[PDB]
Amino acid sequence: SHMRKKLKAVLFDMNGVLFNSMPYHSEAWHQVMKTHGLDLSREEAYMHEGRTGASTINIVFQRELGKEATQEEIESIYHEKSILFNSYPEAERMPGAWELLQKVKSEGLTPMVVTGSGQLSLLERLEHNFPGMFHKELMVTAFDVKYGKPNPEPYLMALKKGGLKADEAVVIENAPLGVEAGHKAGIFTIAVNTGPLDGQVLLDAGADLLFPSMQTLCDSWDTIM
């Protein structure tokens, strides 16, 4: 209740929060890896949600083959994963995301995007799907980071870009590595379990609140702190 008046900004992940894109991202990781000669299950792709493509790929190479991926393997796999993602009927808005962003903006809060994604098709569609909401100066993407989630790094960058202190922001995340990153950046973190995981893993990652959907979050927004 003290900390509600402090709030200046709401920091959203994109995949699994703004867009219902994760069934596609997991499918694509799995398929591109299969094609390369590596086993990456759809469930495990979900566990890597938040990491850079480069990080995801390297980790999977270590676990499966006992070696680093080369820069060329990384660029090739990542480019293919993107082609494959773009082959599916374009991902739609998560139900509740746009209603929530209207609530946030009417409360005078600044929306931000903090994503580990580099998917240009989705980043360019932010304006078309949530008009007037986001600005490129107030976003953090895969293009900005050296390490990425679950390194607090991208949310630390977001606080800096927004001229914010950790207590002036809230994080909305759906994936454990992202919840971790927000938490370790010292920001109050709301988890929304939009994926196929036990909500417990989101609490274990440091989430302050847990909601089952973006819609239910939106409904309870006004009763929070």
Contact residues toward Cl ion (CB under 5 A) are 117-119
Q: Does 174 bind Mg ion (CB under 5 A)?
A: yes
- The label of the residue with tokens 């979050």 reads 217
Site mask, Mg ion, residues 15-54, x = CB under 5 A?
Answer: xx--------------------------------------
3-state secondary structure of 191: strand
Q: Minimum Å distance from CB 39 to Cl ion?
A: 20
Q: Which of 114, 116, 141 is nearest to 51 (CA)?
A: 116
Q: Does 202 bind Mg ion (CB under 5 A)?
A: no
The two tokens of residue 6 are 């402090």
Q: Minimum Å distance from CB 78 to Mg ion?
A: 17
Q: Which residue is nearest to Mg ion (CB)?
A: 16
When CB distances are held under 5 to 8 angstroms depending on the partner's kind, the choice from Mg ion, Cl ion, none that residue 119 binds is Cl ion
Q: Which H or E run contains 209?
A: strand 209-211
When CB distances are held under 5 to 8 angstroms depending on the partner's kind, the choice from Cl ion, Mg ion, none that residue 148 binds is none
Q: Which of 135, 208, 127, 137 is nearest to 170 (CA)?
A: 208
CB 194 within 8 A of CB 175: no
- The label of the residue with tokens 């977001």 reads 158
Q: Does 193 bind Mg ion (CB under 5 A)?
A: no
Q: Could you list the residues that contact Mg ion (CB under 5 A)? A: 13, 15-16, 174-175
